[PDB]
Amino acid sequence: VKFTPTVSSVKLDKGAFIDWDKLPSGAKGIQSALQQQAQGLSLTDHKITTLQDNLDSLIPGLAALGLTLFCMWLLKKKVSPIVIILGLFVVGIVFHLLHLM
Amino acid sequence: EQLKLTKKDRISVWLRSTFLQGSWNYERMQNGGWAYTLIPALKKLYKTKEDRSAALVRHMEFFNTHPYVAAPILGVTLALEEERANGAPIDDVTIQGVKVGMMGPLAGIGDPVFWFTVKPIIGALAASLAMSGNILGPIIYFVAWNAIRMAFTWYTQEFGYRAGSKITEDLSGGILQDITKGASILGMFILGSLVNRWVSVKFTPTVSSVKLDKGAFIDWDKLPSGAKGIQSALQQQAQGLSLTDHKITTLQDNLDSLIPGLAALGLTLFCMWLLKKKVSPIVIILGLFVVGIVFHLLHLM
Amino acid sequence: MDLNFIQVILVIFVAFLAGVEGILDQFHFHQPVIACTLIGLVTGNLLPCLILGGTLQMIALGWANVGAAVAPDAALASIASAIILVLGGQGKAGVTSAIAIAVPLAVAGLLLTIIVRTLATGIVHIMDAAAKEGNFRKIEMWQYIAIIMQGVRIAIPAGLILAIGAGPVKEMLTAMPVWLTDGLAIGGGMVVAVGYAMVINMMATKEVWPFFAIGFVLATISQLTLIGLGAIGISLALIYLALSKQG
Amino acid sequence: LTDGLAIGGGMVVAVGYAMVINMMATKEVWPFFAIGFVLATISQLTLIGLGAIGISLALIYLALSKQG
Amino acid sequence: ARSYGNGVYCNNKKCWVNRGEATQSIIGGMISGWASGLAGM
Amino acid sequence: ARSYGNGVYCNNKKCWVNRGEATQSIIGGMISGWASGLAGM
Amino acid sequence: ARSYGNGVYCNNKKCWVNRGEATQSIIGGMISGWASGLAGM
Amino acid sequence: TSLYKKAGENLYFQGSMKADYKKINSILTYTSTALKNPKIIKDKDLVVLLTIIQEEAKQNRIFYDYKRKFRPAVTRFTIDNNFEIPDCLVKLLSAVETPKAWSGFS
Amino acid sequence: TSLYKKAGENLYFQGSMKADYKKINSILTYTSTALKNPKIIKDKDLVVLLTIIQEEAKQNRIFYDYKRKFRPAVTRFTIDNNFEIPDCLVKLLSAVETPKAWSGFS
């Protein structure tokens, strides 16, 4: 259960990205870029956060666990598993059409 | 009460305790050194030549412990034999009982302290000093190790002599079962970790080298120039694109796909089975060396 | 090459001292730092022998005799490697070949000390016969003889290496194949499984195997250190004991 | 349509997991489910390692329950 | 580089010690020795 | 690439199998099937 | 950057909040507070 | 020349030699004496180990205590018996094998 | 001026002031009364805590309940006693220290 949409795209400050414009030339530039990447500097000047990132901030697999628990509850309510399978296919198609998955 | 062990006799016993492991046969390990250590004491205490022989035969029985923690046992034995020579009713069973009941737990507590705690640290310090060309390393090792050894042996021997079997009845009981249980659990855990991490069984050969598709490698030929090219390469590497157009999979990769350390665990279990089958460990060590050489010759390791 | 009569005698004496402390194991003259540094001092090659001793002591930190199970004999490894390094020239740069040959020499010394510890049984039987007579002098004499024999165990290979002069030593040092060295390194890296097997067999029961499995699996997390794993094991043992005493 | 069908097919397995759990879930074994779920988030642990951990935990629990 | 245990490595011309691996080896040997000694009483 | 389970992926022109994911799927199915079969007796 | 807790950092001219660290701080404080409150009855 | 054969055995196997008769007879006598001791009888683990040793001795073989269990059991019995040991257990302390080499912990 | 000294103590240590005699006498009286209550006697933890408090009061000192144990124990006793509490425990509820500052969970 993976979610595509992005919730925020902030412009990060001057000292947090590599700033390829001000970079040495040749092997020195490659070394500087690798060192800055190792220090944690972003490869771009914008920090994009997705809904999947927010969900994984709590715990990875949260949506999968929720879907499994909902399926358990539906099965307990005498809903046939084939209806649930067809509904899962339909939900996948719809969420793809809505750019949610 | 006229027979008393002076400080000179205790000093002689403490000095002779250096030769505790002089013989070390395989059946009664430290019996000869234990009997040799006590000779001045049994020489002063006993005189009739039947007491001498009886004491010697008594102290030639099986003995084995850590050579340093034998000092309190020596002191307790000195006190007990001094009492026995004075007419006290310590006939034969108390002395051997004290010896056997002390040699076990004392060895089990003294091996980790000296062999695996103090010696590794002091030796590591000395080796670090010596590899850097400093002569101070061996000097520090010798001085510290010998000072600790002699001080511990002397003070523990005196404490045991002045206690006189009291420490035996003071402690020891059902606590040694809980300690053994917890030690066994921790040992199994840590030995599993050590079998996973320190048994080095690595396989070199590759099982497959496939040519991966166009969209899975960086394609350095079609890349920007300058800092833009470096940024594009770093971004593509972050996305998981391979640095080459071929994906090489090794046998070690396949083994780690199941679980890392599988070959080490298998080798350890095979060694356990071989040891159970009365195969001597030295044969297993030589065979492991031979297997390493052969596997290197066959490009397997 | 330059070893005169005095230096040969001193080398033999240092080897005998290392062999004696191999069994006595009190003054630790058999440790690689002490033995290698003494060989260097008596031979005049102080610095390379000191470096070799430090390296071998780092290698031989965990060589401990526990019960009847004997560790791989650091004494012979140290003495033979130092003597071969001295005889082969190339003092500071020859440490690598000495380190490569040290471990097989350690195993050979382990075999030799097993043999000598087996032969000590006859000496102990003679000492029993002496004790049946109350003879302290005979017991002391045979203890001294046992110590002397154990020292001679190491003193003889040193004398043999000295007899087989520097020529053959150098010719075998240079003619050592690389594949042999790499295979020996691989084998030495695999040796520790024997000690692990012995320890596990000592403490293996069907009630503690799950803890072994848990430790083995948790060691696959590279971000966990050994102190952390030990703390986890201690905590698990404490919890198991607490839940077992109430039953 | 093809991508949505692939997403749905990737989501289908939750039904089988739900049936199995419903069959074998009690309030005494839910903690083991939670422990396995959390430990699966460690990507460096393989499935054989997780299975070995589960088997060891079951053995320890049975051993500590037989003496009670 | 050939590994020789306790973090000791050797080229064809030089030997050195990895301090982190040596420390880990010392710690692990200490823990295992304590556990085996106490378990064998 | 569209994922179809058991390490099977398909492009718009080609299908392939990831061997590692396929092996993991087989192992997990084996463990889960054994556990569910033995738990349901 | 100077850390001030709950994901709050400040330069010599600007202050900002790390949202992930703030969320983790809230969650951890919640769990610890619940546990300490219930354990102290 | 029996010592050389014993050394060869110790370097190769366990129990591959003749297992000389006097030691076997002594082991049998001491195990029979120990199994008739009520304090020893109250100790189940020691009784099991002594029975194993006696069974081995009945077939002219020496017990290969590769698990290193007999001597800690004797020590436990001695500690539980107010630090007192019968002569039979003292003489039997030197009747096991206790594997003779190992590789270290690192 | 005793309140200022108490504030200085609370900012520095615990028990560094005189521990005025009236409070100590009241604590002694109520602890003696409570330890003679059969329902309280049936509660072992409350008896232990009251004994600790009484020993502290006998030396003109106030118990520093840095573990925060006394009041939850009194609450547990009250709940187990059909939600009823003797007057001695009510008066002793205000006889501990309960450290006066902390840093938060984050």
Ligand SMILES: OC[C@H]1O[C@H](O)[C@@H](O)[C@@H](O)[C@@H]1O
């Ligand atoms: O196990 C205690 C003791 O046993 C034997 O005597 C020898 O291996 C010693 O080195 C060891 O310390």
